[PDB]
Amino acid sequence: GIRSVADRIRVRMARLPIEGEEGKFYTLVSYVPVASFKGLVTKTV
Amino acid sequence: TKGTSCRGTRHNKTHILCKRCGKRSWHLQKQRCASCGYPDAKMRQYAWGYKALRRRTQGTGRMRHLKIALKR
Amino acid sequence: TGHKGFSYKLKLGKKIHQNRGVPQWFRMKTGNTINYNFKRRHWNRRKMGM
Amino acid sequence: VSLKLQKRLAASVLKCGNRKVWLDPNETPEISLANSRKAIRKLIKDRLIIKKPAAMHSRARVVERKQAKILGRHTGHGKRKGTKNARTPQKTLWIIRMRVLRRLLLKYRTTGKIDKHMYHDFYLKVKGNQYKNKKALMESIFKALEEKKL
RNA sequence: GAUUCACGCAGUGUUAACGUGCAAAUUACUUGUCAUAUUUGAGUAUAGGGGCGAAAGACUCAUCGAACUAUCUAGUAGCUGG
RNA sequence: UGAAACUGUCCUUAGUGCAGAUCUUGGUGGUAGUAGCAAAUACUAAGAAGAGGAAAAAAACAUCUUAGAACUGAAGAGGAGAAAGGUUCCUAAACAACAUUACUUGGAUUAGGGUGAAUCGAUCCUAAAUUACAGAUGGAAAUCCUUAAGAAAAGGAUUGAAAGGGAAUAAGAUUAAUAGUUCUUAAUCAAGAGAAUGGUAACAUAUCAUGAACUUUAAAAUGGAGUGUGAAAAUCUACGGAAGAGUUCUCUUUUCUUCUUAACAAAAGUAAAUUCCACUGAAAUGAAUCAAUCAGAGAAGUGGAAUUUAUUGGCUUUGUAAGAAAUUCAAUGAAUUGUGGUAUUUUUGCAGUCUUCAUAAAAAUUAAAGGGAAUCUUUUGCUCGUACUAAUAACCGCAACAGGUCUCCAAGAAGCAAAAUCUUUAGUUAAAUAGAAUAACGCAGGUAAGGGAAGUCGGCAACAUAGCUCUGUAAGUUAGCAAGAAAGAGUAGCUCUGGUGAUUAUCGAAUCAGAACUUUAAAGGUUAGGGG
């Protein structure tokens, strides 16, 4: 709901070229479910 | 509550259109017209109402049949 | 109201008919000053008292 | 293009509210061309417009509560909020007991266990609040029959 | 023409809000009341030295110790301003 | 600069000279890019259309679809009407102005479309009341009278209700919008056209089975309260399935949705209540209700008749009528549509009881009686209203104003409760603009060490008590009350036990009492008396 959000969230952002114009770029933030956040550092997928 | 609130219940007509003068001056409960003096045969005119006389009188309408007669 | 007299409805219809504007061709006449109908009213702007 | 007309027309054909109408989002140009009820009905038959199912409402929680309260689980002092007469009306208990006790005496008179004079005497005793329930009246009748034969 | 709660209603207190306001009298909580001397719609009756009033000179279309409107009327002013 | 009239001198004439009058009318500044655009819980993501989210985060982006999250919470922000409004209704094009930002949106602009009745209403009848001819009154305008004054009207004239009375229509489908009005099917009503039997009796016979003048009776047509009960619907629930959906790594023979039926008629089966009829005659008085109440001008018993119970005849059932409709499956065509309940609410009747110094309308219209004067088919059904809002945006308040305005239908939980609180069907997410920062002073909601009204005109404001069960309860008193006086104890969860019925072991009702065990020791989330 609007009143509560998870204290820690893990996301995956991907820089991609825009379909309409290839020279320009855009970000796509997605959700990566995890069982726990222990031992999770910034990984370049 | 004599101001804004008391105006909400005003949805009952007092006057409606009159058959002889066409104005909304026919009193529904008095059964007479406040303006042209209905069923009374004579039209309602007063000397203190000089503007009322210059609003509805002879010459304020079509004069369908008198315009030919006086021209004749 | 939903229920209305016969004559009262015809005087309602005429008020609808008179709420129109000047036709374009009438505005192109020579020496014409009538551009807008100043006897116009709208249901939510002025009540016609009838 | 606003699909307000199609949403309203579909709700009248599907016989549901505007909240139960589902217009497929991937063929807006196909849906927006239907400006009549005849055209909408074709879109419904072709599964372009479907009716959402009603939101589920389970009575399982209420069912378990009644099951526990049948066994008197929550019917304690601290869960009683109305007066004694409010929860169990006293007058209706009298009407229930009067019917039960007067029915028994009517059954015995026609069966011949008691006669009219004995039936009449017990009738005013029943009305006088003498016997709490059926068993007390049956005991009194049984006792009174033995005094008769002595 | 008992005691109370509720749908509603009123307007006891805050002398709260607002006070070039949501509003030319309203809002919030609190309080009182919430069917027989009750609440309420439409129809109908009562008109200005008149009506109507469980009576406050209260109410009679935001107008009342005498309504509104027009005429007498450019009322009169030893008073005030130009 | 401007582009067609004007000037000097002398006499004559005057609507003849403005800084003020809170002067009149019009226009315009400072204030000032200031005060504001803060009631109604709330929006986010992806896509489409569009000139209209750009960018060094310019942190915000109107409309439509989908997803998530929500609110009104069914005495609604739902679905419909009366008054009032009057085209505001629907569609398309289009956005200059308007809805305190903007708008592709609109109750805004432009242009077309839309309102179908023999059965719904007006029309008909009269109620409070209202108005005519003649008459009476008055200087006059005009007032009075409403059947009394009349050579007027078998008897008293006109109007007066879209909530009073009233001949007769329902289901399904259909439109961008009208629908008891259109279409299909199925009915009804009015106006027409073609001197009898049966039963002891109460009373009964698809028209039957004649019935004039005149008279009478009844119906239309009559308060409220409270109690019991019949029936239907809704909710809940038991048994038996069919079809579809949800959950499923942890379980769940599981949770959820559908399983329907009209007007008008028929009469297999079968109810409750009241009133009458026949037989017989009650005392050793009986009969009966929740309460009552009744009986020799005749009880109870047995056997009957009648009426009421949302159309025929109340319920099931039947024709209508499954061919409709709902739920599924397939690519127009196929599948199913049992039976219950000693539960609750609403509606609708019925039965008696209570209450009044209150007794709680009339006519149009209809039927019957007393009386004895006389000797199935088909046609038509005219006039008018009918769109839409009915309100936190269509009504009245200068307005898209937190004010005001008459009604109908009305789910689950929980509880005494149509209370507060949460949800379902339906509706809506916008309703005088947002983003950032998180200073003082504010408005709204709170908490607090120790003390406890010392504050103040004054316990103003806030705090505090609060449901239910048991015990107990003073003075005073009009003997009815005071009284929920005051005061004290109990209350949770889990596992059990007993009481209160129906049919002859099974079936069902939530209610009361009791006992062990455990714990965070229990009315208090909401609702909820401070006392003397």
Place this chain on the structure above:
RNA sequence: GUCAUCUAAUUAGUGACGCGCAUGAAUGGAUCACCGUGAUUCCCACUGUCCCUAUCUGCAAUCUAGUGAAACCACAGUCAA
């Protein structure tokens, strides 16, 4: 007013006294049980009323983008005598 009483302390309250400026009998006199969003005093309980203030939340206020009034205004606006 004087006497009691209520309090540590009483122009307040209650109960008495009465030559009562100027009470008094349907202009009604005396007496109150119940009742009252009526006026007054005192106790218990409770509490930010107070000793004496601290602190929390929402909405604004602050700044910005769009939009954008009003009352008022002789001219104006630093003091002492």
Place this chain on the structure above:
RNA sequence: CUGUUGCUUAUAGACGAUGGCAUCAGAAAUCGGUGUUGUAAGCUUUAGAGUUUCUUAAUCAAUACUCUCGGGUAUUGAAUG
């Protein structure tokens, strides 16, 4: 040189201002320290009053035992790396 700007910047702050760093900048996680609350979820102690059923066989059962000084939180205006 100074200012803008960036760290959604602090020892500062209504806004300006003021203070710091600006490529060895900054930010971010994760890890350890340091605090808060009180022993997560799954299976096990017949823990376990009783009921129930097969009849010592299970069940269902508030609460309780071991794993468990557990689990969760922790700059947001906390400290290292």
